[PDB]
């Protein structure tokens, strides 16, 4: 993939006024919520606003989390490198590489899935992180394994072509790229003239906004929806109008941390790296498609997947048709997409999985746009129902 | 006031594909509001959908409110332009003008006071219209007697001033604008080509797809927060989280009534009748000053207004501030505002009267665009909440 240096669409989207007055309308919301909050701890409490407390909960063992993540960064930056040292210049010298070579890639196939595979899963699951804190590094673990197999899969044909020709990285680029916002080791190659600290200034006081509006929306939208809503009926009804109540909260979760992660967040952390040389997604709310709605949204994973998983998924399987490709890419997104939900939530019921499915194969056999945004009015909203019902469930009883 | 024959501003800015998606996002949100309410009243009744109860008690006395607007019309269309015909020629010819003149003024003033002033509240008033249907005429009551008022203000003058140097309407144009969307008598002069009745039927067709939307916004979220929700605890917490949790309802209202009303109403009614000629709002969305915004919201009610109001008002009055005036006018908008809901509503608490000053006397003494939205989504807010609290607890007691 080529990475051309435009921006992000929404930064040169929002100087528009009426994308402008969007934007100063959501945080006048976001005025209005921590007004609404501040005085309503002001009256139930009498004083002492200004509280943060399920901030403190969900972020509480940080400690903690900073060190598994720092074992973490400095496990995904020397062992991949220095095993991938060690193993070219013995292919390039030793009489047979056919038994060597799967060696080495057993010996990285055991780190990926057995380090990143097991290290940011049983520090979870023993010191019991809590759900946010949990999720925050199994988010990191899933960037690792991605960014360290994409760093393996473009340097091991690099290196078997230049020796059936008869060029190993850098420390420091390597250093750099496992910063960088991109999933693909091409890298930031293209790169940025100036870190402007007013601009990455901003970007983090979006960021920071935006987490807080996430907490306010879970405060004042998600807090009566589904805090211990237990006066059981059972009811289709009461389910059809938590599904229906429920898409406002969730549409919102949906643009605002779309928003959030993917603009500010990473846009931080492209001119504070001065990688801003690559777009991150386009237009998702103008689809014409399903499938076309799929390659436009979080265009890093779908880089990632679509690239490395397809390409190689169907040039190995060498099927007669690609759509079973397509098909079985988009079902190991899903199980992907399951396993972050189950470890960060500790959570079975994977309704993302049939619901994904669902949507999928009833879209295959401008009123498709209108469909598009019912589908993902309906799905959104079903979401975030039923994976709250279960948070809140548990956390029942 | 000069008319330009420039189209509404929103039907030139909905072919931006992220304005259409917004459209498509609420006609979904439409979609899943009719299937939400079907699937509710199939799990409710068990079979029998689509009943359509509240439509038919708001819209109850519909013969008679045609009847009333009948005479209405005709009183509107024939007294006076009778009037004005026989006090033409009489001001011509008489030796004493003066007050013959003032004669004939004190009849146009009975009638618009007496007929136009009684009429519509009296048959309100005696066969006890439901809210909508008194609605209805009452705000054909207030554009009937703007209307007269223009008229009337705009041929007198001319009248003495060909009388001075020493032009009465024909019954076509006069009787053509009593239809013409816009408030004064200038007229549709610049008219458009050719009626589209393919374009008029889409616009008539919004206007009942967003009737109908306005009916699922009162079905699904002004029932649930405001229908006999009378447990009471008389807190003021209760009080706080109805004004937020009715910012959603009311601000759907509000955009999609503008929309609705403005834009698509009189846009059918415009190339029905071959003058769209005009604009009627610019983006009160983006309004740096609160008296910025006042110029740019119903430019046909603030053309009416300032111009006549405002313009006579210190004319007559030749105050030193035109503050004052302007202050005055803006009272004047504001009891006659509350007046069309004290009629419509059959109440007292002029909610939007008092919070209309504070609001406007608050400001008096981007971030003000932010300030903006919160005090139009705040001030929306209680105006509904309060608005509906006090017809249901009048309807609850
Ligand atoms: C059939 C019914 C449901 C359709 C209703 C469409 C209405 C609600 C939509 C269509 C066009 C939309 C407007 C188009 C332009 C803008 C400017 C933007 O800066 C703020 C939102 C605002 C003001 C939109 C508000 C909502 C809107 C009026
Ligand atoms: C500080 C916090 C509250 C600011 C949050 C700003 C977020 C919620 C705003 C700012 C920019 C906005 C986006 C700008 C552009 C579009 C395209 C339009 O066709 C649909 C809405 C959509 C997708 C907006 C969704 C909401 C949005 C992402």
Redesign the interface.
């Known amino acids: 993939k080529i990475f051309i240096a435009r921006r992000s669409l929404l930064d040169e989207?929002l100087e528009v006024?009426?994308?402008?007055?969007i934007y100063?309308?959501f945080?006048?919301?976001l005025?209005?919520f921590i007004?609404?909050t501040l005085?309503?701890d002001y009256?139930?409490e009498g004083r002492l606003v200004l509280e943060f407390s399920l901030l403190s909960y969900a972020f509480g063992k940080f400690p903690t989390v900073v060190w598994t993540w720092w074992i973490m960064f400095l496990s995904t930056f020397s062992v991949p490198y220095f095993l991938f040292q060690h193993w070219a210049t013995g292919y390039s010298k030793s009489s047979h590489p056919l038994i060597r070579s799967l060696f080495h890639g057993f010996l990285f196939m055991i780190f990926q899935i057995g380090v990143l595979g097991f290290g940011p899963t049983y520090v979870v699951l023993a010191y019991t992180l809590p759900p946010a804190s949990r999720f925050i590094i199994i988010f990191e673990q899933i960037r690792f394994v991605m960014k360290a197999h994409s760093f393996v899969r473009e340097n091991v044909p690099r290196v078997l072509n230049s020796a059936k020709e008869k060029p190993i990285p850098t420390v420091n680029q390597y250093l750099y790229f496992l910063f960088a916002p991109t999933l693909i080791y091409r890298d930031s190659y293209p790169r940025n003239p100036t870190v402007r600290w007013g601009y990455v200034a901003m970007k983090f006081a979006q960021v920071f906004g935006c987490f807080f509006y996430v907490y306010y929306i879970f405060e004042?939208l998600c807090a009566p929806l589904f805090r211990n809503i237990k006066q059981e009926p059972f009811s289709?009804?009461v389910l059809?109008?938590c599904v229906?109540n429920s898409?406002?909260p969730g549409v919102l979760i949906l643009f605002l941390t779309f928003f959030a992660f993917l603009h500010c967040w990473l846009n931080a952390f492209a001119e504070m790296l001065r990688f801003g040389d690559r777009m991150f997604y386009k237009?998702w709310?103008?689809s014409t498609s399903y499938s076309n709605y799929y390659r436009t949204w979080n265009v890093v994973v779908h880089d990632w997947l679509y690239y490395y998983a397809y390409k190689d998924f169907l040039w190995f399987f060498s099927k007669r048709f690609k759509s079973a490709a397509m098909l079985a890419v988009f079902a190991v997104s899903a199980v992907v997409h399951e396993y972050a939900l189950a470890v960060c939530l500790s959570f079975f019921y994977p309704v993302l999985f049939v619901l994904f499915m669902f949507f999928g194969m009833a879209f295959n056999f401008?009123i498709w746009?209108?469909?598009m945004?019912?589908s993902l009015?309906?799905g959104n909203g079903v979401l975030l129902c039923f994976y709250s019902q279960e948070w809140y469930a548990r956390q029942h009883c």
């Open positions: 989207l006024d009426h994308i402008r007055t100063h309308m945080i006048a919301l005025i209005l007004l609404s005085v309503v009256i139930d004042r289709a009804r059809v109008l229906f898409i406002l237009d709310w103008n401008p746009n209108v469909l945004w019912t009015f309906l």
